[PDB]
């Protein structure tokens, strides 16, 4: 059982719209720190909301009595910023949060100390060629590198060390972490880079994918998100067409190249943002099924379901406007997309207790053997024009 350690109202800084919003936060003893539109009455807790292993800053700009939770989540540094009315309030909160976090590190260390089983056994920047900037965030950059000794290509995420201070995933369509090392002032993650090209480029050249082509890519995405949701208890919150690449054989790869940009331009890409993220509401696994819907609409229709060059009007489209479909789209596709793009997460396909299973049973995916998807036994509809892992057809 997870009991409430401290609860109350905070002003949460907004990333997309209203900048400062009052929210009712519960800090629980499992480490979750979650804000709601209103104080709630009564799913599985998401690690996205954990304060475990966070660092806590007090600050006075741009508002007095603000404080910051900074966490490293897998390979991404994220910052949550809050404001209270009195400095005494801020000390109650930072102290409660630290106490919950410390108690979590404590019981954890005692448990692994007790269970270590002759796992008590005791790479540098020079080893790599910089090739090309892939992204810059507030606390790091992501670069395409060539590992000198092997000639292989990787993305390297380079983080500022002082904002932070074997666990990989067995899913074939996620970005695997190859090495992790540190320098005197940096933490570097070396992760795989697919050389079958960017799906945004493939879609742009083909104009549209057939429903069957989109079915193949969507299935692989569904299987990766299911894995994240139910094995890792994390939501991705970053699904967009540009974060999908193909490997040398035509199988999907979801990239892990994102960096938060708060404090350097939105963080993500606005046209893929789910309504509950825009409004800074309580969100859960269902934000990813919204992202799946935007990506598959784009795949099957050749364009976005919501677009406007003015991001203020795009947000309004995302929040208010009902979705329209090209006249050629079939009804199973339409059923899938409008279920994925329900504005209310509570109504959204995948937004119920069953999560991915709701999508895997949708008649648009009928006939898919989900075990063969996970084992890469489905035959790719498109084989990219590379015949080696070190082939640079799709960068040069």
């Amino acid at each position, epitope marked *: 059982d997870v009991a409430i350690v401290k609860e109350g109202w905070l002003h949460k800084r907004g990333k997309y719209i209203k900048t400062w919003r009052p929210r009712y936060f519960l800090l629980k003893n499992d480490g979750t720190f979650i804000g709601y539109k209103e104080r709630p009455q009564d799913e599985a807790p998401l690690n996205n909301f954990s304060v475990a292993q966070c660092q806590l800053m007090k600050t006075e700009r741009p508002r007095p009595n603000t404080f910051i939770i900074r966490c490293l989540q897998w390979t991404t540094v994220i910052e949550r910023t809050f404001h209270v009315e009195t400095p005494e309030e801020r000390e109650e909160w930072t102290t409660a949060i630290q106490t919950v976090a410390d108690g979590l590190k404590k019981q954890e260390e005692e448990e692994m100390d*007790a269970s*270590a089983e002759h796992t008590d056994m*005791e790479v540098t920047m020079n080893e790599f060629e910089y090739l090309k900037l892939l992204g810059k965030g507030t606390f790091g950059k992501v670069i395409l590198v060539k590992e000198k000794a092997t000639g292989r290509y990787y993305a390297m995420k380079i983080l500022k060390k002082e904002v932070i201070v074997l666990q990989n995933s067995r899913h074939p369509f996620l970005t695997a972490l190859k090495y992790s090392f540190q320098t005197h002032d940096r933490l570097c993650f070396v992760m795989e880079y697919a050389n079958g090209g960017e799906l945004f480029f493939h879609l742009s050249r083909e104009r549209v994918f057939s429903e069957d082509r989109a079915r193949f890519y969507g299935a692989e995405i569904v299987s990766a998100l299911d894995y994240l949701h139910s094995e890792k208890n994390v939501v991705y919150r970053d699904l967009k067409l540009e974060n999908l690449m193909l490997d040398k054989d035509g199988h999907i790869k979801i990239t892990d190249f994102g960096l938060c940009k708060e404090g350097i331009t939105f963080c993500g890409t606005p046209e893929y943002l789910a309504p509950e993220v825009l409004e800074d509401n309580d969100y859960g696994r269902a934000v990813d099924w919204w992202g799946l819907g935007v990506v598959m609409y784009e795949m099957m229709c050749g364009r976005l379901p919501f677009y406007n060059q003015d991001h203020e009007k795009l947000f309004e489209l995302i929040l208010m406007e009902e979705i329209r479909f090209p006249r050629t789209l079939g009804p199973e596709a339409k059923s899938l997309l409008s279920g994925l793009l329900k504005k209310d997460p509570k109504q959204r396909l995948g937004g119920g207790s069953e999560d991915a299973k709701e999508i895997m049973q949708h008649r648009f995916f009928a006939g898919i053997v989900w075990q063969h998807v996970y084992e890469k036994k489905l035959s790719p509809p498109f084989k990219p024009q590379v015949t080696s892992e070190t082939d640079t057809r799709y960068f040069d």
Partner: nanobody
Framework: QVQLQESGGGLVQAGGSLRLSCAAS????????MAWYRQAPGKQRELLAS???????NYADPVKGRFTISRDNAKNTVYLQMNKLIPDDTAVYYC??????????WGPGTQVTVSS
């Protein structure tokens, strides 16, 4: 404070024996896998021996049959009995917990020197 302290090192002739002890204050050795390590003037630090909470022991090869690791719950201390010493054993010796090991926290260590 919160720390491990090694003692029992010194100069000793080849084939001889030495008993190293690691005294824990602020740490309970009953609750933690314990291990002994050593590091020589130019080389990597070497896992030597570990004892789980169950009492089961394990040894790296160049030491098996000559050293024995033991933990005495009463005096909150681990031991490393070192027998039939070879000058290839000359090093500074450290005991540690898993948690401290991953954080690279080390006690002062004790120097063992064997030559003849």
């Amino acid at each position: 404070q919160v720390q491990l302290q090694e003692s029992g090192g010194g100069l000793v002739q080849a084939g001889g024996s030495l008993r190293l002890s690691c005294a824990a204050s602020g740490i309970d050795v009953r609750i933690k896998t314990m291990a002994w390590y050593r590091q020589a003037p130019g080389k990597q630090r070497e896992l030597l021996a570990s004892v789980l909470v169950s009492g089961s022991t394990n040894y790296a090869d160049p030491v098996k049959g000559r050293f024995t690791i033991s933990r005495d719950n009463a005096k909150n201390t681990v031991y490393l009995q070192m027998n039939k010493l070879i000058p290839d054993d000359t090093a500074v010796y450290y005991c540690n917990t898993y948690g401290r090991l991953r954080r690279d926290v080390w006690g002062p260590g004790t120097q063992v020197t064997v030559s003849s």
